């Protein structure tokens, strides 16, 4: 349901450099390190990305801090997650994000991840809760407050838990990709690393499950599980994963590349004149010389229409609404 968690928005994030961390895995075949020109949509490097503060835990006084936002989707996003103590329990999607369009529910649970496609009455900011009992120590039953109006639901799927739980920060990173027809899931859980940037190395973003739905998807919201109380905003007192719950949002754009003791990956896009030269020669090393790459042309600045000075209209109704032929 709606416990309304829209916040008049607090202290903004910086946009820190993404080094690579973003190459997923195409195909099942048996070659080793074969310099492979296949074509699929991958991550641009050393441009802008964004992360955000998940539960921006203050010092002595603050506010209540659930600020999980609704974003558009450019048909594929690299996701990353510094968080280790499993507050991310799913994602929700929709174009209208209402009961007009069937809407993707993907929601993680203690023994499965439920996958659902159904037009739900969305709460504007729902939340999930993981607490502590007094009697049992860690009984982690999860209260799913995100789906309300189960009208025309067809898709039901039981899987393994996607995020599972060991001292240092485990990056549990994802590539999702809206394609019409089939929808693609590409994920990695790294081992333990202390980098307060997005942690170092490449990603072995392995595929786990496929969704054969492939509808229109326009807009995005991920899920955070926190036992937030109703009671005191200054004494908020949840205190689960203060500051390391920061999750990182990529983007994709049409762009071409090369793959690689096995095959891994690389590139093939034209951005500067040097990569234009590497595009036209189809070669990563280019030797010394003058090379005719492409062609320039002076562009149209505006448009004009030149039509003569006539005012009256043509007699259509003098035959089409006339007497007879």
């Amino acid at each position, epitope marked *: 349901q709606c416990v*309304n968690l829209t916040t008049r928005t607090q202290l903004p994030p910086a946009y820190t450099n993404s080094f690579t961390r973003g190459v997923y895995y195409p195909d099942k075949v048996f070659r080793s390190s074969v310099l492979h020109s296949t074509q699929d949509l991958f991550l641009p490097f050393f441009s802008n990305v964004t992360w955000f503060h998940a539960i921006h835990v203050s010092g002595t006084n603050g506010t209540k801090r659930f600020d999980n936002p609704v974003l558009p989707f450019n048909d594929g996003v690299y996701f990353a997650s510094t968080e280790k103590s499993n507050i991310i329990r799913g994602w929700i999607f929709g174009t209208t994000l209402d009961s007009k369009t069937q809407s993707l529910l993907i929601v993680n649970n203690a023994t499965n991840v439920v996958i659902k496609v159904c037009e739900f009455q969305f709460c504007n900011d729902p939340f999930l809760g993981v607490y502590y*009992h*007094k009697n*049992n120590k860690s009984w982690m039953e999860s*209260e799913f407050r995100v789906y309300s109006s189960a009208n025309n639901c067809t898709f039901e799927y039981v899987s393994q838990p996607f995020l599972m739980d060991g001292n240092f920060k485990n990056l549990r990173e994802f590539v999702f990709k809206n394609i019409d027809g089939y929808f693609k899931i590409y994920s990695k859980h790294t081992p333990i690393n202390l980098v307060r940037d997005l942690p170092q190395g490449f990603s072995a973003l392995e595929p786990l499950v496929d969704l054969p739905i492939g509808i229109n998807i326009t807009r995005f919201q991920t899920l955070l599980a926190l036992h937030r109380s*109703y*009671l*005191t905003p200054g*004494d908020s007192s949840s205190g689960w994963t203060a500051g390391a719950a920061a999750y990182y949002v990529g983007y994709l754009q049409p762009r071409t590349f090369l793959l690689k003791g096995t095959i891994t990956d690389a590139v093939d896009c034209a951005l500067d004149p040097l990569s234009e030269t590497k595009c036209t020669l189809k070669s990563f090393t280019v030797e010394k010389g003058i090379y005719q790459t492409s062609n320039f042309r002076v562009q149209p600045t505006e448009s004009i229409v030149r039509f003569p000075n006539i005012t009256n209209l043509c007699p259509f109704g003098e035959v089409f609404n006339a007497t007879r032929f």
Partner: antibody
Amino acid sequence: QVQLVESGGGVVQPGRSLRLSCAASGFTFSSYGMHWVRQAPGKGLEWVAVIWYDGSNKFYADSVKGRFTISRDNSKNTLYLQMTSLRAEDTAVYYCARADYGDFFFDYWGQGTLVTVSS
Amino acid sequence: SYELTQPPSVSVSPGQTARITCSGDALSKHYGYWYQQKPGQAPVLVIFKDSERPSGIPERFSGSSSGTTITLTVSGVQAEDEADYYCQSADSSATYWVFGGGTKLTV
């Protein structure tokens, strides 16, 4: 210490809007979410209603949901309301409640507004 | 939420004080509390988090939370013991509070 100076209990028809008060003493006002606990004379206590600190969500209990609107305003320095279309249920001693999150407790209890319908 | 299980009236008078038993499976998720109704109709909290009494309290006992039921905060009796108790076992994050009809304490 906090003791909730609330008054203005008085004459109302059944099915009539009375705008009862819960003014406060002691505590800061946009950092506590104040509850409401009722008590009929002759029965025990029961929780009824609670808001947040800017009128974002307004929870009521499982039998009285939607029929009240408790709210706040930072200039008026009361707690105004309309009880809307009672079904001979508002014969009690209303209280507010300040909670301070010692795992969902209540700390201090005021004097008590009493509103009565005449049957 | 649904109402807590309570005894309506316990009448006892030796010097040994019998414990009021409050039962239910909802005390594991958030746990059973105690609310007074003093002479004067001025309730106070006397014991919170099942463990600690606040500052300047008339000093009595506390709770232990042995499993399902909790033994309460009552110590050896004075002449001011007319006031009674309210079980209050809360929920996790839907945040419903049920007090019940309460107890009585009369020697």
